[PDB]
Every structure is written in structure tokens, then in C-alpha cells.
Amino acid sequence: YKLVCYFTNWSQDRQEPGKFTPENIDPFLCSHLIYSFASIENNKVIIKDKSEVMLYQTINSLKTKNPKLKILLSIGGYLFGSKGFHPMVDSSTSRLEFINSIILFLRNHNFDGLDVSWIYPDQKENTHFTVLIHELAEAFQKDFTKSTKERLLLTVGVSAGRQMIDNSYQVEKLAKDLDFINLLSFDFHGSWEKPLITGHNSPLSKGWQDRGPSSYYNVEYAVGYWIHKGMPSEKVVMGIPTYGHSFTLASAETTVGAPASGPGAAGPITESSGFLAYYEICQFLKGAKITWLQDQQVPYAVKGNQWVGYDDVKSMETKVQFLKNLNLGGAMIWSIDMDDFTGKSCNQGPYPLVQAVKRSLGSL
Ligand SMILES: CC(=O)N[C@@H]1[C@@H](O)[C@H](O[C@@H]2O[C@H](CO)[C@@H](O[C@@H]3O[C@H](CO)[C@@H](O[C@@H]4O[C@H](CO)[C@@H](O)[C@H](O)[C@H]4NC(C)=O)[C@H](O)[C@H]3NC(C)=O)[C@H](O)[C@H]2NC(C)=O)[C@@H](CO)O[C@@H]1O
């Protein structure tokens, strides 16, 4: 099994216990690490990060410590959107420039591959995304035929939502071109929804109130659908979140599907109404009531008018058992810098969530 771990370049600006740098990375924690995110300037790959050159130092230390560790570079993410890939994708000339810059950049800086996480192609960018991936795949393969080093890996963070999947992807082709997908099996529910009701960020299974299309909004369905569409199960690396989605409750009802007036109060460290990192969640749970959903196989917690749907150690072990049953490629984490990486907040040691995933994957 793979354990694929995204980390981010904005977590370094947080205060403790959320102040993360690549030096917080345990080189034996994960099989793959993925830096989030690179940029594109003048159709070439760059890293925009005040700490860029220190990142390279840590990459080299980590890979020296653990010769098996793979470290990939990611382009994309929600904020980058589709706009970020233009004008690079607009022509084969500009795409060739990009692809050539990637190979040189990854080799120069000791990266093992590229993750393309286009959020999201949809109908409009379906062709652009398909060709980009295919051209990258071929170039990497070409490079390999000429090289003494391993072939550069190619992966993609992909939607777990059935409609977005149908619109964005040509799955059989993707299966040939990608080494694996990083299934983004989270953000199923949240304070952007209308009607504005509580719902879990990342339920494993369908809710008792779900019927029809709402029956798609869970991890088991997403996984099954990708397989159905032609992605081999062992190329499905299943995303698990270390964050939760929060709601401010509109009434006294505290159940799933209860009315919400908006996102929950911002965490003190992440300062973004609507989500909480796990290290903030452990502080939230103090004085909260926690319910484990038997239908959906994940917890939520309520304190005052605040409702948080999140993933804990029980969820980690339950989702790992699931991915193993379905013969998936492994687990992916978004993101390790939102786990309690210092261990100072949750009283469960360093990376309590990710370590549980690791322990569960390694268990016979
Ligand atoms: C609105 C919404 O929730 N949409 C989701 C979308 O976020 C999902 O995108 C994937 O999953 C994760 C988890 O949501 C994404 O993480 C977010 O990524 C953005 C950057 O793209 C983060 O923005 C950062 O925000 C902090 C906090 O305000 C700022 O300080 C930073 O400057 C800013 N970073 C940058 C580069 O500008 C945001 O905080 C992340 N949120 C969380 C909770 O971590 C991630 O982008 C994306 N994952 C991958 C691998 O591409 C998407 C999944 O399908 O669904 C919805 O569209």
C-alpha cells in the first residue's frame, strides 16, 4: 500500500501549534510526499515560496534518510482553479515549453514526479486536461528511455463527485497515463451548500436521509464509481482529510441535515470560517458532544451553536479497512500539516491521524 502525503507551503505562516515547515516531516511517516503547490509563470514551472531554497535542503535530507521516499511536486489546487492553467494549455507550443520546464526542474531539484491537481476541468477544460496529462505521460516516458534515473511519476488529484467526474475526465485514458489518482474524497458537504444544512466533510457511506443523487456524496460511492469508469482499483489512492467542515447552527436541531446559518467560527490558528485543522478540532472537542454516525461511519461533534463534521482515529482505521477490502492502491492525506504534527494539541503523540493510517495499513 501507498501512503501519499500532501503538505502545503502556506502552513509555515501559522502560529503554533500549526506552524509547519518541511522540517516537521517524518521521513518514514509516508511512502510519498507531495508539495503543494507550484506555480506557472511564462509557461514554465516555478515555486513561489519564501522558503523555496530551504525546501530543497529538506528534500535532500529526507531522501538521504529514507532512500525509498518519493517526493512529488503538485500544480493546481482550488485557488489556482482552471485560470491558473491558462495560457499554458492553450497551445502545443506553450504546453511543450511547460513540459520541458517540468522535466528540468524536477531533475534539478531531486523530485520524483509531478502531481497535476486541476480543480476542476469540468466540461469546458476536459480536453485541455486530457491532452496535458497525455503529453506529460509521453514526455516522461521519453525522458526515461534516455535516462539512468527512474521514470518521473505522474499523478493527479481528482474529483470524488460523480457529476464532476463525468464532465471532467476521460477515465480509461487517464488510467494509462497516470501512475495513480489521488482521489479527493472529501468536501462532500460544507457551508457552501444550498439549502444550508449540516453535512459531513467526508462520510464513508451513504446517510440514512440520502436518496437519489445525494446517494453519491460519500467515499464508498466515489471509489466505486472511479473503478466502474475504468480506473484499476490499485491505481486508486483514497484521500482522507485531516480537517473538518464546521457550521454555525440556525436552530436547536443538532443532527445531520439540521439548518445552518453559515460556516462555523474560524479556528484560532487557521483563521478560516468553515474548516478546522485536526489540531484545532482537539481543542474544540473539549466540552463537546460527539456522535458516531452508524450509517456514514464517521463522527460529528456539537458544542453550543457549533457543529463540526470531522475524521478521527476510528475513522482512519475504518477507512483503511475499507480501502484494503476494495484492493485500493493505498491512502492519501490532505494534508499532513493539519494533523497534530507537533503532538502538542491532541495528546495522542505526533501525527495521530496519519500514524493511525500507517499502523492500520501495515497491520496484517
Ligand atoms: C471552497 C471549497 O471548500 N472547495 C473545495 C476545495 O477546497 C477542494 O480542493 C482540494 O481539497 C483541499 C481541501 O479543501 C484543498 O485545500 C485548500 O487549498 C487551498 C489552496 O488551493 C487553500 O487555500 C489557502 O488558504 C489559506 C487559508 O485561508 C491561505 O492562507 C493560503 O494563502 C491559501 N493557499 C493558497 C495556495 O493560496 C485552503 O486553505 C485549503 N483548504 C483546506 C481545508 O486545506 C486543495 O486546494 C485541493 N486539493 C488538491 C490536492 O488539489 C476540492 C476537492 O475536490 O473541493 C472543493 O472545490
Q: What is the DSSP string of 48-76?
A: --TTHHHHHHHHHHHHHH-TT-EEEEEEE
Q: What φ, ψ does residue 13 adopt, rounded to 5°?
A: -90, 0
- Domains of the chain are 1-241+311-364 (3.20.20.80), 242-310 (3.10.50.10)
Report phi then psi at 153, rounded to 5. Answer: -80, 155
Q: How was this structure determined?
A: X-ray
Distance 12 CA to ligand 1 centre (A): 15
Minimum CA distance residue for ligand 1 atom 31: 10
Q: In whole angstroms, what is the distance from residue 349 CA to residue 344 CA?
A: 7
Residues in contact with 10: Cβ distance below 8 Å, sequence separation at least 6, in sequence order: none
CB 300 within 8 A of CB 289: no
| C-beta of residue 40 within 8 angstroms of C-beta of residue 88 | yes
- Cβ count near 287 (within 10 Å): 9
Residue 72 Cβ < 6 Å to ligand 1:
no
Strands 70-77 and 113-118, sheet pairing: parallel
Burial class (CB in 10 A: 0-12, 13-18, 19+), 151: middle
What distances in angstroms separate CA 175 from CA 169, 243, 256, one per listed residue?
11, 29, 36
Task: Give the pairing type, strands 2-8 and 32-41.
Answer: parallel
Q: Does any ligand 1 atom lie closer than 6 A to the CB of residue 81? A: no
Q: What 3-state class would DSSP assign to 280?
A: helix
Is the CA virtual torsion 183, 19, 73, 354 positive or negative? negative
Mutate to test the pocket of ligand 1, among 15, 37, 49, 78 (most ligand atoms within 8 A of CB): 78
Give the pairing type, strands 243-249 and 306-309. Answer: antiparallel
**C-alpha separations of 75 from 17, 167, 222, 364 in Å:** 27, 21, 23, 35
- Burial label for 313, CB within 10 Å (0-12, 13-18, 19+), is middle
Resolution in A: 1.9
Cell of 45: 514551472
Contact yes or no for 165/225 (Cβ under 8 A):
yes
Check if the beta carbon of residue 37 is closer than 8 Å to that of residue 80.
yes
With cell 454555525, the residue in question is 248
Tell me the helix, strand and coil percentages in the chain, rounded to 5: 35, 25, 40
Assess whether the C-beta atom of 310 lies below 6 angstroms from ligand 1. Answer: no
CA of residue 16 to ligand 1 center, whole Å: 20
Q: Give me ligand 1 centre to Cα 326, in Å.
A: 28
Residues belonging to the binding site for chitin are 49-50, 76-79, 120, 184-187, 334
Q: Which of 363, 198, 194, 202 is nearest to 278 (CA)?
A: 202
**What is the distance of C-alpha 273 from the center of its chain?**
19
How many Å separate Cα 110 from the centre of its chain? 22
> What's the CA gap between 312 and 327, in Å, rounded?
22
| Cα angle 277-309-159, degrees, rounded to a multiple of 5 | 80
Beta-bridged to residue 259, according to DSSP, are 197
Tell me the torsion sign for CA atoms 12, 192, 198, 215. Answer: negative
Distance of alpha carbon 40 from alpha carbon 115, whole angstroms? 14
